[PDB]
Amino acid sequence: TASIAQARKLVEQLKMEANIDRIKVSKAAADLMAYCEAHAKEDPLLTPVPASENPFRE
Amino acid sequence: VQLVESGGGLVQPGGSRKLSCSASGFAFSSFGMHWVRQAPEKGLEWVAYISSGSGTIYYADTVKGRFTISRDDPKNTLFLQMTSLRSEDTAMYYCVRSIYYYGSSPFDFWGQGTTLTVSSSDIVMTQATSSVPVTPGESVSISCRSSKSLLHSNGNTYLYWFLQRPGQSPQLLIYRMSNLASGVPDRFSGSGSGTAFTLTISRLEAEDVGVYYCMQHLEYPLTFGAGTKLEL
Amino acid sequence: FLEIDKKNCCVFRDDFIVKVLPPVLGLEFIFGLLGNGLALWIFCFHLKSWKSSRIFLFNLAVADFLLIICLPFLMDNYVRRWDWKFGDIPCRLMLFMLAMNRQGSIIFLTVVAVDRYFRVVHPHHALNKISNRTAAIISCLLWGITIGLTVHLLKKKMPIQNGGANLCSSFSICHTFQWHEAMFLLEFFLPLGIILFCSARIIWSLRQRQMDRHAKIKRAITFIMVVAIVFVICFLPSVVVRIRIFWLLHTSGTQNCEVYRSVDLAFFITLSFTYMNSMLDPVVYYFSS
Amino acid sequence: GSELDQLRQEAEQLKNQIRDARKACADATLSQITNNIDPVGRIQMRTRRTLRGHLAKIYAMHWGTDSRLLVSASQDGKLIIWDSYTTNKVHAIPLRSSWVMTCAYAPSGNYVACGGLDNICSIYNLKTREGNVRVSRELAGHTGYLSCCRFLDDNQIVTSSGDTTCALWDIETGQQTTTFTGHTGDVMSLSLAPDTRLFVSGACDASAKLWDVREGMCRQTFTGHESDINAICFFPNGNAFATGSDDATCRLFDLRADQELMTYSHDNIICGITSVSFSKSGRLLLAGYDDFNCNVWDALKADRAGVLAGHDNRVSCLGVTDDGMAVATGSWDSFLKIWN
Amino acid sequence: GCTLSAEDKAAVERSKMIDRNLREDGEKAAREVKLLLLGAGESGKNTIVKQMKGIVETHFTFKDLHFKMFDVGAQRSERKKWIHCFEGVTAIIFCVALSDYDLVLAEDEEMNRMHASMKLFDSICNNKWFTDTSIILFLNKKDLFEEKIKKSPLTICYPEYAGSNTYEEAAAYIQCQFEDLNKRKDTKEIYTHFTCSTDTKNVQFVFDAVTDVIIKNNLKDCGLF
Ligand SMILES: CC(C)(Cc1nc(-c2ccc(O)cn2)no1)C(=O)NC1=C(C(=O)O)CCCC1
């Protein structure tokens, strides 16, 4: 009964990963894109920071 | 941690004397050592610097060629050697440890120093006030000034504030004019700009009375101010 | 034929120098220049290894590339039958670049052997793991001896002018001991002994331990004998002729120099075998290994 | 028998049901939404600093919180704490086990953690009174090699091992307060959420799992790679993560709609990924391949925007600062390099 | 120099001292020999380990040379994920006890222990990280092999073999069927040695093999190769 007990534990896990809510893919893509747009100024590597304000200047 | 220092006493003006501190309870071989001198009922003055690895040595302009510092890492013992002692060498001497790397807190632990008596350009820092009377429970402020700008180009401001309670050795209170040393309450603070700075205390307590001192560490020599006493 | 330098000498500027030596030297020039130039190009841009044995070999290449660019002026000196028409200043530069870039070929040729004697006979020795910063201290402390021995031939009024037109030369028959002939004898006799000893023990240790069964451990033994075979060919002729020169000079004096007419013709032939060594080293040491 | 057969069968149609449920929630693709926006230009980044001093292969680096210090680990038997501005050496720490695979830097700055191929995780104290760095804790209890470690706060740490388990540890307590089990193959990497509430882990069975620190439970399982998973990390927003694999592919996974977001792969690449990391705005994704050089792709358009080609061997580790000031790459040639 | 404060110079000094200590530490690590040990289980791995004296380590010295043995028996993990950490070792030492063909492992009564050892040696010998790495093959527990072989010819595990069933021809055949597994034959050498549990040579053998590997490495460093 050990094997069927292990199958019981596995099917329990299967039960409890099928009890979640789902959203659409378009909504998640839009959220990712919007977060990317709204922070397009505080990142030196994307918008090249002028060489007058960078402590790694050669 | 402790730096038990010995070697003081009374000396004829023409004579030699050695001052040795023994370091127990830390990694002495990774710590730059200094000697700082204080005169009776006066302020204090820097003396000498020897770094980690015996690479750089510095003397005060008034002690050149007549003092000699030395180190011993196998047994964690540091010496200073004196041969010419004019009458103005009567003082006491405190040996200070410090370590220099990004974020370190130099002049962190101070020791106790020893007393030696003798038979009878530079930035300037001045503390105009000599005593501010106050009763416990309100704000207190002390002000210090420098002969020029101490803000180095790198961004730091090598100004130090530290205290001497009546009847004992000093201990760091503020390093780099804004930062608070480890083991002291948040009652203390330090602000300033350019060449004018102020130490400040919000809530006074019976342990807060003492004599306060300012120092700069931008270049050599290291120069103090006068001693600003507080009275109840 | 007798002539008077500071000493009593009897140079023999004669014929048959003019019709063979320049065509001999032109090919050696165009091949030594090429070979050592490509060796230098390889070691300057295409060698990221830079371990202690490839920096004892780059220096050999720089030392024997210099005694190549020193050739064309000698071709013009020989073509027009011993007339030195380039003034006094080059008669120091060229006679210094010959006497320096030859001893510096021999010295860097004799370190690339003691280096192997240790990599085989005495392996695990500390010397096999020296840094390439403590090796480019003795690859510069060894140029010092060459320079410091070839300086005292710069402080002379060198172009000798007489009835003979401007010989620029310090190899000449005479009767006074010039200790810069002993620095010919020694510079050939010592490296040969060292090279022979090292190669002999290398080969005799590499079979007493029975490694002498692998296919590509024989090509190394043949290439260890190849380099030592081309060190007697290129140098011994010009040496033995000079022993003959001193032999004649002691048997009879500098009285009737007719005696020497033939033998001095030999020297400036047997010397051209020494320029040979600088154009087949970029193969015996560089690509064929 | 009949019971075993029926229970295995039931497991099978439950797996089928879960697969059908993640298929049923898809109606669009990332690329279709994102193809319109203008692409970033050629990302020309030059080596502004070159940290040298390791004598062997390097496996792990981690940036400091201030975005000025960092730590690195190599087979020489040394951990090293660097100053990125002045190229100074702040700290050098020995180790007892030369065979290390991971190290991490505390979010405050008081401690570091190192471990690998020994079944241990060691915690060292940086800001001590004594002036040196000394070992504070030896977390023991796994039965495989330790692959990754991350600090949660000054008292909690999460580890993943090769024996197919993840665990949560309490440094002061010295014992596991939660064990996360369920991977078939060896677990190779993990990343913590921005707010320290959930963490993802990726394993040799070509799958990753999302975990609940408080519940110690596998909330989601993610599949799609053809081979092992070598490295993982969250998006800065905390609702996506990026997977690096051993079949010359990188992938993006969502949490709310647990699907495949995007795949980053080029036919000229046939080697393995060793590390991934994200940008300050999450607009660029850095991947360290073992074709000796690093790639900088658009984390939003699945294009290639730049290359960091300055290494002469396998690229192992990679990191980005908390403000976006620099990126740092280590490699098997024993050289660290800072790009701006 | 002129732009640095009095506190920056001390930091530079500290970094320089750290540099010198790193450099001094990394040189003593290059005067030691790395040997990786493998075997099929109770194939005499433990007995050779006790003869010479998580991941296990062993250290020994013999005629002024330092050897390190890295025993990875108990890892029990996916070997392809941790094997390249040993890419630059000097030698591999592979132990198989040659009286272990009739006695089959507990896993199977039919597939013998010798077939498993052959699988292991074949898999290790053609690894991509060991194309220039030499192997020392120890064949252990020889005395018992004659007792086990005289009761039944090698036909049980070597049915296609024909021999009068003496120790010499049997052991020699086993060694052949072992060294024929190599697929390099030009950038790799295999050193085979027959020994019992106790010995007075298993130490000289490894000395000799590693001396050979070192001399070849040196000659390659010359370029005389
Ligand atoms: C200067 C030299 C080389 C003779 C010489 N060299 C040294 C000397 C001493 C010590 C030492 O370490 C190195 N060199 N002393 O004399 C010389 O006359 N050379 C000539 C030629 C040649 O050499 O190719 C071509 C034709 C013209 C003659």
Numbering used by the authors:
A (entry chain C): 6 to 63
B (entry chain S): 2 to 121, 136 to 247
C (entry chain A): 10 to 298
D (entry chain B): 1 to 340
E (entry chain D): 2 to 54, 183 to 354
Extract from the study:
To obtain stable HCAR2-Gi complex, we co-expressed wild-type (WT) human HCAR2 and G-protein heterotrimer (dominant-negative Gαi1, Gβ1, and Gγ2). The HCAR2-Gi complex was assembled in the presence of MK-6892, furthermore the single-chain fragment variable antibody scFv16 was supplied to stabilize the signaling complex. Finally, the structure of MK-6892-HCAR2-Gi-scFv16 complex was resolved at a global resolution of 2.60 Å, and a clear cryo-EM density map corresponding to the compound MK-6892 was identified in the orthosteric pocket of HCAR2. The overall structure of MK-6892-bound HCAR2-Gi complex displays a nearly identical conformation to that of niacin-bound HCAR2 complex structure, with the root-mean-square deviation (RMSD) values of Cα being 0.6 and 0.7 for the receptor and the whole complex respectively. The structure of MK-6892-bound HCAR2 complex showed that MK-6892 assumes an inverted L shape, engaging with an enlarged binding pocket composed of TM2-TM5, TM7, and covered by ECL2. In detail, the binding pocket of MK-6892 in the receptor is divided into two segments by ECL2, one is defined as the OBP, which accommodates niacin or MMF as well as cyclohex-ene-1-carboxylic acid moiety of MK-6892, whereas the other is defined as the EBP, adopting 6-(1,2,4-oxadiazol-3-yl)−1,6-dihydropyridin-3-ol moiety of MK-6892. In detail, the cyclohex-ene-1-carboxylic acid moiety of MK-6892 makes a salt bridge with the positively charged R1113.36 and forms an extra hydrogen bond with the side chain of Y2847.43 in OBP. The 6-(1,2,4-oxadiazol-3-yl)−1,6-dihydropyridin-3-ol moiety of MK-6892 resides in the hydrophobic EBP, formed by residues L1043.29, A1083.33, Q1123.37, L1584.56 and T1594.57 on one side, and the residues H1895.39, M1925.42, F180ECL2 and S179ECL2 on the other side. The outward movement of M1925.42 and the upward movement of the side chain of H1895.39 result in the ligand-binding pocket with a larger volume (about 160 Å3) than that of niacin-bound HCAR2 (about 37 Å3).
